[PDB]
């Protein structure tokens, strides 16, 4: 069974988070940039997004948490289907939420490529687009709004005793804390980048 379904979009430090879980022995954790290493899993995305029923064991079997998109999204149906998992919300000051989104995903969610490699990535980002940001990605007022608004609706579903609303800025002790896992002393909290990923994708 899934342990911790991580809520928050991307752009919230999400692959340090991921380390950090996978460090706390609370992994193996999904990611967006696990779905590229697994194969079959965004023809199984992109299922879930068109509103079709798949079996959640099938994309989580091997995994015990999740981070970033596609997951973020379904937080309410997956907190539901494993009730006994937590929940992670990564947050983020939203200026700089933006900055970083449009810096790292939006060109790319934006773009169209001939690389059949891509095309499945490209309808999954497509439809987060849609039915996410209202197929708008350019506009940093309706972008931060439906950011703000998702983390609202998070926080008012999900019972304060499950939720763990964490920004990487808070370090180690937020996690160790509400999971009751240590770290050695003096352990720097991750600070990684998955940006080159992204922006490679096209080229
Ligand atoms: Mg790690």
Redesign the pocket.
Known sequence: SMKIIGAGFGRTGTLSVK??L??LGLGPCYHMLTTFEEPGHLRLWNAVSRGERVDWAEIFARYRSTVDWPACDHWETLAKEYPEAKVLLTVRDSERWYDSFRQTLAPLWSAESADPELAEYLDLVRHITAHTFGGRLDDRAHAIAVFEEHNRRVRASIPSERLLVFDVREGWEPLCAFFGRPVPPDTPF?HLNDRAAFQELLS
């Open positions: 380390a950090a996978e460090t991750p």
